[PDB]
RNA sequence: ACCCACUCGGCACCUUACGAGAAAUCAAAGUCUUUGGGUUCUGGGGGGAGUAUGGUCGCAAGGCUGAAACUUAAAGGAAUUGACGGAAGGGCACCACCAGGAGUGGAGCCUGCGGCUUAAUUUGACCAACACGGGGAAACUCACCAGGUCCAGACACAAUAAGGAUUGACAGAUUGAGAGCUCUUUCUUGAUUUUGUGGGUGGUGGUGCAUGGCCGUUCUUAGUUGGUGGAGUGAUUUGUCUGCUUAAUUGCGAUAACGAACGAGACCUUAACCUACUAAAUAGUGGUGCUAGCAUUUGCUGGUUAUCCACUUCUUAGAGGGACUAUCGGUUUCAAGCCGAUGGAAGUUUGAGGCAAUAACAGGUCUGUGAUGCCCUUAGACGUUCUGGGCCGCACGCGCGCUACACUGACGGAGCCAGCGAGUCUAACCUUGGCCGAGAGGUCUUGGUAAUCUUGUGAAACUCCGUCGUGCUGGGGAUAGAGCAUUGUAAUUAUUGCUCUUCAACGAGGAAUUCCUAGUAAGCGCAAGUCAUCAGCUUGCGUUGAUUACGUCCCUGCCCUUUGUACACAC
């Protein structure tokens, strides 16, 4: 059985690949003049999303990370 | 026959060797007079028992304990 | 003229070679490496070629004498084994024929194959391919086509690597898609990986002409082999055979063979016989003993071992018996056997199978296999999944089949009989019964893991009584339209079932060709396999049940012997 080669009509596709981002303690919490700090994210309401569950940010909605809910900065 | 299935004991064997695939086939037929189980001898070996040859007397001569 | 005994010369024969020969064979072809009686002629691998030329003879045809160039690895002799023969002899087969039966080939449809078409219409196979791959494909199967993911890239090494090496992601573009596949801003996890280098693993990728295993075929036949001995320089041969006989290399026998082996037979399974044994609410019968239901000076039935006693004829299955061609009559190298009749359940090896030798085929299968060598491929994969499509595509040709062409029938009513099976609790299998529905089916329950229930599978052909009335007709039901259900996520390219409507060829089929000898052909249905659904297929089962023949070698072939061969890739 003989066999062609293959040939595609359409261009190869990359595989996406992890952000570069020197961002890991820059945008997570903020120290004050004396000391004190409270935690600026939000926390999700299901149990099973930890303490540190750190609600992500976009546009027009707050993004968990672990459970997946979607919330408002503006509520 | 038959025998075959009684007497006759077969194993097939693969060998991979570095050219290809090498069949081994064994056949053995094992002794029927030997084991205590099934027939004991193939068919149509028929075996007879000797005659124990006696003379015959002439005479009648009663005998009495 | 015959007979007998001789003898010389001659044409020759028979046996065997002591001898010779490569052998066939030879009384010379002996007296030859132990080579010498005399003498003439001829040959030096096969062709070119008895050709060319010269000479010579001939009236001519041609004869006699007679090269070379060049070409070529064999040509040739005798014998062996096989194969083949429009060779002979002897046997045999319904995958051969005769006498026939049923047909197929003609029709419509189902299915497989080729060809065309197509993105693909995956593919193997050409007596011994073509309802075969258990190949009845909606998804899967799948191997093909258009695309989308994923790594399920083990291990070793090196590099990146404190937020990194890495993943995962709601929504919005996007994609057939609620695949974060790719992205749009940014969160989770954390030395599990990423990248590269070796390497590895998969592959229904190729190679069945590299292989194993299995299967088919040669070949349904009777055939095959060594030990010792005999023959031959040897390959080989005899054993393993003239005749008769057998289904049989089965035997009687003959015999430079003897004594053995495999195959055949024997054996095993199944099918028939057993009023013999052992017994059985998971099989039955009787007593109706028990109540009893219906008709009546006694029949048919109901519930019948937790209502009850018996008892195995029928049913079941264990141990057994039974047939060994028994007896008889014939015939025979009167032996192996064969033909009739009588008994017997059974007398074609009683029927049918299972198993089944040596040697082989470039027979089929790498698409059954985590059987497999080699080659190729391996991250945009020939790996694996997911969506959709194809495998089914139709100017056509062919092979298995199904349904028919009608009155030995169709239709309607009624009668009303098998055997082989299978069946769920690791989940929905076989389904009784009641209810609903024209139907197909739906629903509520029951029993059955089964000699217990489905199931007495109350199958069909068939039978009886009626409608039809020789009109392609009320035969035929292809094609097509409408609706109702079931299986399945999914039914369109209509899965299948049901109802109504449409109602085509087909009036018995050219050449040609298949199968079969008794419970067999043929008709008829049923169960199982494949199966969620789907039989017009297969494997088995039973019901009804012929005609013809107990033969031959004419055709097609098979076996043995002899014979010829310039065949051995074997006519
Ligand atoms: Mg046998
Ligand atoms: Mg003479
Ligand atoms: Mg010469
Ligand atoms: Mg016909
Ligand atoms: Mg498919
Ligand atoms: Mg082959
Ligand atoms: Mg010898
Ligand atoms: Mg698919
Ligand atoms: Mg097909
Ligand atoms: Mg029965
Ligand atoms: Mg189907
Ligand atoms: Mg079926
Ligand atoms: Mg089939």
């Given at each position: 059985k003989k066999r062609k080669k293959k040939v595609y009509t359409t261009p190869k596709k990359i595989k996406h690949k992890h952000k570069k981002v020197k961002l890991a303690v820059l945008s997570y919490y903020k120290v004050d003049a004396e000391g004190k700090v409270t935690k600026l994210r939000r926390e999700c309401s299901n149990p099973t999303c930890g303490a540190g569950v750190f609600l992500a940010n976009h546009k027009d909605r707050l993004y968990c990370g672990k459970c997946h809910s979607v919330y408002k900065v503006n509520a | 026959g038959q025998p075959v299935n009684d007497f006759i004991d077969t194993a097939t064997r693969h060998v991979l060797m570095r050219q290809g695939v090498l069949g081994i086939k064994v056949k053995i037929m094992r002794d029927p007079?030997?084991?205590?189980?099934?027939?004991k001898a193939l068919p149509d070996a028929v075996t007879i028992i000797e005659p124990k040859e006696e003379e015959p007397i002439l005479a009648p001569s009663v005998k009495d304990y």
């Open positions: - | 007079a030997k084991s205590r189980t099934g027939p």
